[PDB]
Amino acid sequence: RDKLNNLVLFDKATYDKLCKEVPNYKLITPAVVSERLKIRGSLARAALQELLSKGLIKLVSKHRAQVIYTRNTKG
Amino acid sequence: MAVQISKKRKFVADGIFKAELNEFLTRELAEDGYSGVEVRVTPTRTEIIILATRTQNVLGEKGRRIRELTAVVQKRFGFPEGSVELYAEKVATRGLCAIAQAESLRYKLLGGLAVRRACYGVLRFIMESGAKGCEVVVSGKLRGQRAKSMKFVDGLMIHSGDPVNYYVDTAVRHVLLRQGVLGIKVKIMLPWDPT
Amino acid sequence: MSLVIPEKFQHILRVLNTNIDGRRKIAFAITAIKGVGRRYAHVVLRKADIDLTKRAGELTEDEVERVITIMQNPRQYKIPDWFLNRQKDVKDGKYSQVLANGLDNKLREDLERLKKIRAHRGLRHFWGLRVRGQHTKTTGRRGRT
Amino acid sequence: GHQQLYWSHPRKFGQGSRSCRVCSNRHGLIRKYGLNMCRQCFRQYAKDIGFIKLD
Amino acid sequence: MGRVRTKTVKKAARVIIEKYYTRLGNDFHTNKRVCEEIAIIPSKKLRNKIAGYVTHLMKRIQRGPVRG
Amino acid sequence: PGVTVKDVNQQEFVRALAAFLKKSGKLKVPEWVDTVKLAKHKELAPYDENWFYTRAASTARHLYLRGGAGVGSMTKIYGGRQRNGVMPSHFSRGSKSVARRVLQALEGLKMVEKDQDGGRKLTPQGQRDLDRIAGQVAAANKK
Amino acid sequence: AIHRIRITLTSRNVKSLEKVCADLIRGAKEKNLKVKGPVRMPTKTLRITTRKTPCGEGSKTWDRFQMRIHKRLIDLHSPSEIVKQITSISIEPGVEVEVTIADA
Amino acid sequence: SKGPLQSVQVFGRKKTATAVAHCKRGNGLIKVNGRPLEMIEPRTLQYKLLEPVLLLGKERFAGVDIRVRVKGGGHVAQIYAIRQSISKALVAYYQKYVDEASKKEIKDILIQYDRTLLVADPRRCESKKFGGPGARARYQKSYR
Amino acid sequence: DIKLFGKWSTDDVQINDISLQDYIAVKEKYAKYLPHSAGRYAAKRFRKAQCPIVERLTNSMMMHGRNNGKKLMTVRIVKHAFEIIHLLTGENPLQVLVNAIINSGPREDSTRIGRAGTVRRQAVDVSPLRRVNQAIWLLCTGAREAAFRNIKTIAECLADELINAAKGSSNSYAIKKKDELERVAKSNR
RNA sequence: CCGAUAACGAACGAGACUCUGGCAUGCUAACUAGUUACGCGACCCCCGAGCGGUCGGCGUCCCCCAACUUCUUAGAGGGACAAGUGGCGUUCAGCCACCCGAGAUUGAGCAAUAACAGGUCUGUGAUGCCCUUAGAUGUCCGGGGCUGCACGCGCGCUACACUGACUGGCUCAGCGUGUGCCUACCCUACGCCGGCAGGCGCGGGUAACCCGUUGAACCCCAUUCGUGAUGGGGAUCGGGGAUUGCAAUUAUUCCCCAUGAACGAGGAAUUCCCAGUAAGUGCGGGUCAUAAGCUUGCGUUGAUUAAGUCCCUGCCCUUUGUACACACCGCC
Numbered sequence A: 001r002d003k004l005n006n007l008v009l010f011d012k013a014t015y016d017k018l019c020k021e022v023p024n025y026k027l028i029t030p031a032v033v034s035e036r037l038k039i040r041g042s043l044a045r046a047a048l049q050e051l052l053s054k055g056l057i058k059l060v061s062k063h064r065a066q067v068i069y070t071r072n073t074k075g
Numbered sequence B: 001m002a003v004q005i006s007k008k009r010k011f012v013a014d015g016i017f018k019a020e021l022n023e024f025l026t027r028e029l030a031e032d033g034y035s036g037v038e039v040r041v042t043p044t045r046t047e048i049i050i051l052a053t054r055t056q057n058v059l060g061e062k063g064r065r066i067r068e069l070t071a072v073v074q075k076r077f078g079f080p081e082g083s084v085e086l087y088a089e090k091v092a093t094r095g096l097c098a099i100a101q102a103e104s105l106r107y108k109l110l111g112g113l114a115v116r117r118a119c120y121g122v123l124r125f126i127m128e129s130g131a132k133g134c135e136v137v138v139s140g141k142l143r144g145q146r147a148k149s150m151k152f153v154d155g156l157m158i159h160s161g162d163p164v165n166y167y168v169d170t171a172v173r174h175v176l177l178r179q180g181v182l183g184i185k186v187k188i189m190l191p192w193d194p195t
Numbered sequence C: 001m002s003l004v005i006p007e008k009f010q011h012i013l014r015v016l017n018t019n020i021d022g023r024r025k026i027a028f029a030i031t032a033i034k035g036v037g038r039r040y041a042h043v044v045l046r047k048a049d050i051d052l053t054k055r056a057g058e059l060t061e062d063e064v065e066r067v068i069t070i071m072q073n074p075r076q077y078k079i080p081d082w083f084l085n086r087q088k089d090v091k092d093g094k095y096s097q098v099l100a101n102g103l104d105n106k107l108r109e110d111l112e113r114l115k116k117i118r119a120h121r122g123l124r125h126f127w128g129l130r131v132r133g134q135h136t137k138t139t140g141r142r143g144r145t
Numbered sequence D: 001g002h003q004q005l006y007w008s009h010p011r012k013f014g015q016g017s018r019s020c021r022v023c024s025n026r027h028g029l030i031r032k033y034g035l036n037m038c039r040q041c042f043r044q045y046a047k048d049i050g051f052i053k054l055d
Numbered sequence E: 001m002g003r004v005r006t007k008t009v010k011k012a013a014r015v016i017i018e019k020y021y022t023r024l025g026n027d028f029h030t031n032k033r034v035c036e037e038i039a040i041i042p043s044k045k046l047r048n049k050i051a052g053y054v055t056h057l058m059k060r061i062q063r064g065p066v067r068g
Numbered sequence F: 001p002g003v004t005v006k007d008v009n010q011q012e013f014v015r016a017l018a019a020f021l022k023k024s025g026k027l028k029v030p031e032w033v034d035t036v037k038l039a040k041h042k043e044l045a046p047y048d049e050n051w052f053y054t055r056a057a058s059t060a061r062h063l064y065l066r067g068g069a070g071v072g073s074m075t076k077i078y079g080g081r082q083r084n085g086v087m088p089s090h091f092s093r094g095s096k097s098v099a100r101r102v103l104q105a106l107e108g109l110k111m112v113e114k115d116q117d118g119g120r121k122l123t124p125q126g127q128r129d130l131d132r133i134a135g136q137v138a139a140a141n142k143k
Numbered sequence G: 001a002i003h004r005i006r007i008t009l010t011s012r013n014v015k016s017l018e019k020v021c022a023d024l025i026r027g028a029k030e031k032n033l034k035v036k037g038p039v040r041m042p043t044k045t046l047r048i049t050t051r052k053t054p055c056g057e058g059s060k061t062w063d064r065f066q067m068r069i070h071k072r073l074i075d076l077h078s079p080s081e082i083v084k085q086i087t088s089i090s091i092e093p094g095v096e097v098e099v100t101i102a103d104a
Numbered sequence H: 001s002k003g004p005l006q007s008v009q010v011f012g013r014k015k016t017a018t019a020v021a022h023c024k025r026g027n028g029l030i031k032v033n034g035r036p037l038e039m040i041e042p043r044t045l046q047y048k049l050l051e052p053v054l055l056l057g058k059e060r061f062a063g064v065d066i067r068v069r070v071k072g073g074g075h076v077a078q079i080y081a082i083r084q085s086i087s088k089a090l091v092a093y094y095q096k097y098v099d100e101a102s103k104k105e106i107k108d109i110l111i112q113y114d115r116t117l118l119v120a121d122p123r124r125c126e127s128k129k130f131g132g133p134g135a136r137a138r139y140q141k142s143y144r
Numbered sequence I: 001d002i003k004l005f006g007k008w009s010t011d012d013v014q015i016n017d018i019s020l021q022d023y024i025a026v027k028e029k030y031a032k033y034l035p036h037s038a039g040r041y042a043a044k045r046f047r048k049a050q051c052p053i054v055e056r057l058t059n060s061m062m063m064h065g066r067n068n069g070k071k072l073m074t075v076r077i078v079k080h081a082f083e084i085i086h087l088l089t090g091e092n093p094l095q096v097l098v099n100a101i102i103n104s105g106p107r108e109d110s111t112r113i114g115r116a117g118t119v120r121r122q123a124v125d126v127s128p129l130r131r132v133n134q135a136i137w138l139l140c141t142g143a144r145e146a147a148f149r150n151i152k153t154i155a156e157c158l159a160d161e162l163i164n165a166a167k168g169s170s171n172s173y174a175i176k177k178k179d180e181l182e183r184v185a186k187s188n189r
Numbered sequence J: 001c002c003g004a005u006a007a008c009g010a011a012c013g014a015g016a017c018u019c020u021g022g023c024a025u026g027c028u029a030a031c032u033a034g035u036u037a038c039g040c041g042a043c044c045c046c047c048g049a050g051c052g053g054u055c056g057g058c059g060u061c062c063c064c065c066a067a068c069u070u071c072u073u074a075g076a077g078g079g080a081c082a083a084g085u086g087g088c089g090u091u092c093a094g095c096c097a098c099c100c101g102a103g104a105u106u107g108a109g110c111a112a113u114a115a116c117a118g119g120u121c122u123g124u125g126a127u128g129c130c131c132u133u134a135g136a137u138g139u140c141c142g143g144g145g146c147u148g149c150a151c152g153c154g155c156g157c158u159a160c161a162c163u164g165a166c167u168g169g170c171u172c173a174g175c176g177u178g179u180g181c182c183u184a185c186c187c188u189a190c191g192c193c194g195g196c197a198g199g200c201g202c203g204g205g206u207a208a209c210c211c212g213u214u215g216a217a218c219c220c221c222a223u224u225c226g227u228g229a230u231g232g233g234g235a236u237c238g239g240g241g242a243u244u245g246c247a248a249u250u251a252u253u254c255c256c257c258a259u260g261a262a263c264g265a266g267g268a269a270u271u272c273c274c275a276g277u278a279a280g281u282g283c284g285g286g287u288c289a290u291a292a293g294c295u296u297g298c299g300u301u302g303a304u305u306a307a308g309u310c311c312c313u314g315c316c317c318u319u320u321g322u323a324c325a326c327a328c329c330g331c332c
Ligand SMILES: [Mg+2]
Pocket: B160, B161
């Protein structure tokens, strides 16, 4: 816990993890995505809205200070 | 119009004129029993009433003193010629004018009366003239070099709240002695009257 | 589309005599060059007509030299004379934006011109005190003790 | 001195141009509402002018 | 708290109750009206403080022998 | 179904009217829009490339809301907080040249005309355009 | 016409101002003049806040002087000329009058 | 059906913000300053303005045209003045046009859910004094 | 029928312990659409107990000068944090908040300044009102400290603080502080 | 204050009083304030409404050519008294709680006897004594200084950031000022030029008439940034452009582009504060040719804690002891 050196852009070993396990857990916010993936956070925002445009992530709030997503329901 | 000054500046100018005239009249007529000035301002012409005790002394030989005062006021304040008139009115019950008693006590002290005797005489005269109470305090270099104050209070004398504004007459006067300055404060609680 | 990092990504660029970090956006990455601020950087990127969103690392070398020459020659690209640093030079009177170790040499040249002319501001610089005529009685004690 | 330099310095502004209308003082003046009067002179003549203490 | 009535109201209330006990009654809003003409009270706040104390003292009188 | 701009979301209305102004490429734009800041109290130039179009949209909407606005009124409307560095912050007006250029662009776009007194208001054509855009944004919000 | 007269009365104490409004309105009503209602411009509070001390020593106690200016005005209406009908003012000291014709 | 003068004008206030509601017979409609009630910029307090209609019922409001003109204060003072004006205008219209059996059952529900929906908050402000930044605070003092 | 923030009915929340039922205000007449109903709750003693607990949380969450009057921002923050806690747990955010307050409010403390005997001096019990006040204060302090110098949002940190306090996992700042206070009270018995 | 009583009868102070704030759909009024209604309009809907929706667009004191005072203004009044109920209390003075009510402690102003070697002779044509009074300590003019820096202290301002900064959109105030006796210097709408500071013409306002419906900030809604001394912070410093003035250097102030230093919440200590209060946040006035990090006021958003204690710091009353009375900073 000295510096983050978070990734500004994805690699293969980060993009595959994003596409394989990010749409699994309930809470999807840019901050939690950045903390879980060691990415910048602006990149996390862009990736999350890209997933929404893909249609596999459900938005709930979309506020200036906080945007909140969730997984699609199964059943 | 634009030539005419605003209402706020006009009223402040009126107050300034009142204060300046009051100071000039106080300085010129202090020994003549001057007490206060009232002015009823009308656009056609203005009248200045001088409340005095020795009004016959204020009005000089055939009104020469009042003529001089009128001309002086006219010149100083730039009134149009003949548009300002000064009259003198004698104060009723001069013992109740706290200002007039201040110059009376100053006259006694300059004459050389003992300060205790002079203050007691003024206090007795005020009560005889009729007041709810009075308080005369004289401060300064009494007797020795060390400053002292003497207070002579008798009767009713309120200090706090609104009624002190309109129930007591307050006057402060300086007296110049060869040792220094004596400060005289005279407060007179006026009696209530429906008239 | 915020994909994986491009293969031809330069994490470290060597524009001019300074070094910049390619992980920040280009507009705030060229501000690392001395003599270039946020305003100048944004206007030269606007003139060079590149994507303000993309990072400095994914900027191709032709675009890099294009923005470099935009910075070095701002007068030819309609950048106004009031926007520059070295307007109306004290030596040759040529409007320019000096952004290099050249900026440092111009600064030391102005300082040494004042020192050799023995002006009051030059003497203040030589003594190491304030030059803009502000009070020194209580502030600035860090540089002395 | 002679007429050329006795009052030659301009006094169109500043504290030297303004003095109290009573005590001829240059400090604490009140130019609000065109009083042009000293700080203490106003305290002396406030009730005479018509300024009272309501609160 | 801080609802203590002073001499100025208490003495006045006692005097007006002694003088005009017959006219006075148990109604505060009627005692405040009779206080308009039975005495000259400079302030409305003073007059209704006096009227309230008058009603209180009359409630006491109807039971016991108050000093008034 | 008679709708007015007051009946729709103003923040989305200005966006849609800026889009309409972009689509109708008749708006005069000064060549220095890429250089200047929108006010002396702004630390940075605006991010959007179509800031002139959105300024024109906002100015037309404000002229709809109340007429007689001049350049000084526009600068007062678009003024904001200047942080003054270490000094305490204050309020600063807008950029008079930008406001005047926007108003002149609207006047040349015929949506705005001068009053008999100072300032300028919306022409009947301007009101028609504003209310048509209000209709389309109301329809878009509905569906 | 036919003439229009506005009388503005400005003073410092509401008692004298109201008296000088009331007697004017009463006289005009007795002479059956059409009197526009007495309108009251908002009062002006000239506030000056100075230091109580003359020397700057003490606990920094401030003196707050107020000056209240009250302004009323009236409009006089008649098919006949009004100056000849009412020429006096019937005022008391402390109030200032301002007669104005509607031309100005 | 065409009864003239079937209207009330009732004001509400909070912190120097006055909002006058003009209520009239007509279709169910409510607006402020010419804008719809739902089109109020601080949407964070949308429910504060929606509180009277939500509590009483759209059926109660189905016969009133309400136009609120608000000209003071800050944002939330505008909001509170507007909602108070709406509630008080409705209760006054019901008071002077329909029975007290309905007026009371509206007033009691409004005053039970929120007293400020019918009575003004009397607190305005406190004057600053000459020894501190605000009304009660004082400037920092030092002894050495 | 109220649905605080448009959702999450209040009547389904049950208060766990009898000691704080009269001081936690969530149900019946404490059912408001918004946690912003400024109503002179400090005018008398024991009146804030009638203030709804979401409004108390909102009032306590705006602190440290940088944001003191900004109550609309705090209302927004509470709304979001409720969305996140509902998303994580699947249960009622009001129930989660109530349980977090119950588990965060300390049950004993220390007092007296008698020369600082062992830790403070002498152990003391706490009133229900002080339990509620200290629970809300601890939750707000924990969220603020968790979200100060990091990328996690205030809403997210408030959410996880409340969730950890409700489940009693001792991963929360409020629970750790409460445990420390109880420990020093035990030492000062 | 009630009561006990060698005291009785009083006087001041407290209170009472004045101003301010909160309520009056009750009265008086309003073209220098408006609201409704109506008539002309302008735009949308037009399937079809049409007494449809918006207008700070124009009119109906441009006198026969509408009413009204709710909103605004300000006067007269009213209104709140511990008055009603329950309990406590000698059932006294009063206290607690509750109902109705706008209001059940709104803030200020004023403010006793006695005193201080407290401050001011640099406020005064207030003043005693003393000094100087023509090579002047009078007065005027030129220049410099009052800012000067190894350092210590006090009041503050800005910050240390994501509850944030930047960019854009939207949206709300109240105090109060404004053209000059001397005295020269006002507030500014609108149009044009410039990127900005500004400049150039035309007005309006001596003022509920014009600025001004004071389009204030914060806040609100979207964008970018992503925990790093970073788009935090803007100190320092270079260059250029304006404005005021007789004059800007030791930078008057303002604008633009560059530089981005300490600073990652601060030891011992210590200040202020109980409800529209603290605090965040701007706007006026004073000073002002040029000007606010100051002060005095105003609004805006708006809380945590507490309804207690004598622990610390002190204060009041009684008893008490005293070798003190320059009164414990005493005395010895
Ligand atoms: Mg008193």
